[PDB]
């Protein structure tokens, strides 16, 4: 199955920078959400979850078709809590009805990363909505109560290697787990609406204890009041992952560059870009625009 990017008719970089700006201004305005974390982290998780249904074997799922807008995918237990990100983006969809759903959901993630002082993430337009019967079944997103070999095998379906997996997981510096959404509770660090390499530093430097939470699931807790999922902790249990965790803990710029590449790839998996498609866009932040 082939999904060819098709640019929204007549649109160019300036149109998409306007959408970026509207998302960014709303992120600034709606500061109170989730005890003043704001909507940045949930938009990053949304962009990942709409992309992470992809299957390299048959090109099903993926960001292209925008299928999170349909009940089956919206209601995936794995997506619990993401309705908050969807609701955030609704007024943006209303203001800019011409942008496709997959373009909007993925651009929401890019905008959140950059507005949270993360790396620039080049972004390409042209995802096209596909109908309800193209929605992937539930169960393609990963479980958190697993070990390193699970994580490695899982991410092969998304064509991600060890370095790409460890870089993508650095997004777990952002936001928090919520007991009602996932059966895990707590944040992973102190700077959880600023994009940094703190995930790796905390994995290496905190004193972690394996405890049960109030949902009767195991998670790793620090006396600092941080937590890691079992799949997060697996990155320091496996020797190959551990090497890369140490690399990103010791090189902020390398983490930013590798995350940017892996996150763009994640958001673009499944999409064929015509040879004459526009180059990827690099959006200016509000701060760079003096806005
Ligand atoms: C083995 C892979 C992964 C597992 C099992 C996993 C699991 C989870 C779980 C259980 C939560 C908590 C959800 C909640 O309770 O609200 C969460 C949060 C989050 N995840 Fe992951 N995830 C993984 C990979 C990723 C990746 C690849 C990204 C993006 C690059 C990502 C970004 C986030 C973000 C930003 C949050 C915070 C959401 C918020 O604060 O609302 N995750 N993840
Ligand atoms: O209906 C929608 C609301 C928010 C974002 C979208 F992409 C939508 O299709
Ligand atoms: O380990 C974590 C995963 C997602 C969000 C967080 F806040 C975490 O500490």
């Amino acid at each position: 199955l082939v999904h060819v990017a098709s640019v929204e008719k007549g649109r160019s970089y300036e149109d998409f920078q306007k959408v970026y700006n509207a998302i960014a201004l709303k992120l600034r305005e709606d500061d109170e959400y989730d005890n003043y974390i704001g909507y940045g982290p949930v938009l990053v998780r949304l962009a990942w979850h709409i992309s992470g249904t992809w299957d390299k074997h048959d090109n099903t799922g993926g960001s292209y078709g925008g299928t999170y807008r349909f009940k089956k995918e919206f209601n995936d237990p794995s997506n619990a809590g993401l309705q908050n990100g969807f609701k955030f983006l609704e007024p943006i969809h209303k203001e800019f009805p011409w942008i496709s759903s997959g373009d909007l959901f993925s651009l929401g993630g890019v905008t959140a990363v950059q507005e949270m002082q993360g790396p620039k993430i080049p972004w390409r337009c042209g995802r096209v909505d596909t109908p309800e019967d193209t929605t992937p079944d539930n169960g393609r997103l990963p479980d958190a109560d697993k070990d390193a070999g699970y994580v490695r095998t899982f991410f092969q379906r998304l064509n991600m290697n060890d370095r790409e997996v460890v870089a993508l997981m650095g997004a777990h510096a952002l936001g928090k787990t919520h007991l009602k959404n996932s059966g895990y509770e707590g944040p992973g660090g102190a700077a959880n609406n600023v994009f940094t390499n703190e995930f790796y530093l905390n994995l290496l430097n905190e004193d972690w204890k394996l405890e049960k939470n109030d949902a009767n699931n195991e998670q790793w807790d620090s006396k600092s009041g941080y937590m890691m999922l079992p799949t997060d902790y697996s990155l320091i249990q496996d020797p190959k992952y551990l090497s890369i965790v140490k690399e990103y803990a010791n090189d902020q710029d390398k983490f930013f560059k590798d995350f940017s590449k892996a996150f763009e790839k994640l958001l673009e998996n499944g999409i064929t870009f015509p040879k004459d498609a526009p180059s990827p866009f690099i959006f200016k932040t509000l701060e760079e625009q003096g806005l």
Side-chain angles (χ1 to χ4, degrees), residues 53 60-61 66-70 72-80 83 131-141:
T53 57
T60 55
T67 51
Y68 177 83
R69 74 191 190 277
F70 295 114
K72 175 175 73 179
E73 184 170 345
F74 192 87
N75 288 149
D76 188 347
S78 297
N79 285 339
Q83 304 94 327
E132 189 155 19
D133 62 0
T134 67
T135 304
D137 283 350
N138 300 171
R140 293 176 172 218
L141 294 158

Side-chain angles (χ1 to χ4, degrees), residues 33-34 37-49 78 80-82 84 113 116 141-146 150-151 154-155 158 164-165 167-179 181-186 192 195 227 229 231-232 234-235 259 263 266-267:
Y33 174 74
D34 208 3
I37 298 170
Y39 279 93
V42 71
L43 290 184
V44 176
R45 197 177 195 239
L46 177 58
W48 139 240
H49 275 206
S78 297
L82 292 183
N84 291 297
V113 171
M116 292 188 292
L141 294 158
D143 295 332
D145 64 334
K146 298 290 200 301
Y150 171 84
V151 171
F154 174 84
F155 274 103
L158 295 176
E164 291 166 320
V165 170
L168 286 171
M169 215 76 74
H172 277 179
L174 302 170
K176 66 187 293 288
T177 62
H178 308 84
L179 203 75
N181 289 342
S182 63
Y184 298 96
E185 177 64 40
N192 56 335
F195 195 101
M227 63 82 64
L229 300 166
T231 42
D232 294 324
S234 87
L235 304 188
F259 180 89
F263 196 63
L266 178 73
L267 273 42

